[PDB]
Amino acid sequence: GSSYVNDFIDRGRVKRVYLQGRPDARMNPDDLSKWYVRNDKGEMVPFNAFA
Amino acid sequence: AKAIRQTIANLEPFMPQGMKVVYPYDTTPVVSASIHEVVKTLGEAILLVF
């Protein structure tokens, strides 16, 4: 969803900083499984387990 | 429209290289041509009656 974190100044104007995945890791339903979410103990859990 | 063209006239000497400002869409010259056409037809109506 291209989240909005904070701002930054450049060349005399305050603009903004966005944060989103690659143009190559959201393009089809096979690439919604490249994203991993952290467990409660440091392990990594894919989206294939629960989505 | 006159104030927008004046603001672009005050902002044009600080363009970068090769930075032209063009006006692709504008609905003001139809208004100017319409008022000029009706004042012109007023003028030739007075001239033809005279």
Binding site: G12, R13 | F14
Partner: protein
């Protein structure tokens, strides 16, 4: 007399006729920079103009 206060530029002046307009009198202008040239360029231009 305030030149005997040697450490500070003590600058005394009278108010204008009406006080609603300004605190100084005369003229006023701002040197600005649309190009985004920074602050050192702008302060050098201010002290050059002075």
């Amino acid at each position: 007399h305030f030149f005997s206060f040697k450490d500070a530029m003590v600058f005394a002046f009278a108010p204008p006729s009406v006080l609603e307009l300004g605190n100084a009198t005369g003229f006023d202008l701002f040197l600005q920079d649309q190009a985004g040239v920074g602050h050192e360029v702008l302060l050098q231009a201010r002290n050059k103009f002075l």
